[PDB]
Amino acid sequence: FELLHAPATVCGPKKSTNLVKNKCVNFNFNGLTGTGVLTESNKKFLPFQ
Amino acid sequence: VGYLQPRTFLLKYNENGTITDAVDCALDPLSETKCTLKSFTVEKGIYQTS
Secondary structure: OOOOOOOOOOOOOOOOOOOOOOOEEEEEEOOEEEEEEOOOOOOOOOOOO | OOOOOOOOEEEEEOOOOOEEEEEEOOOOHHHHHHHHHOOOOOOOOOOOOO
16 A cells, blocks of 8 residues: 555545435535535536536 | 636626636726726726726
């Protein structure tokens, strides 16, 4: 296991629960940890963001 | 072939979420006024720069 200044490309899998919406519980999406209701929307973003 | 320079730009986001206009704040004194006011519509009067 060699660790240098180069960016690592071999990490480990992350295992976690499914998706529970319509509830005011804590969530986490790509490090962004928030607390609220994950309600649906009608807008659309961009296919690279 | 062109080289990028660390300048200052004010992106304009419409209802679609894509960039439609960009104004550089390092060219003309008129474009530098819109950098602080955060608006492309400058009315009459006297403002500051730097």
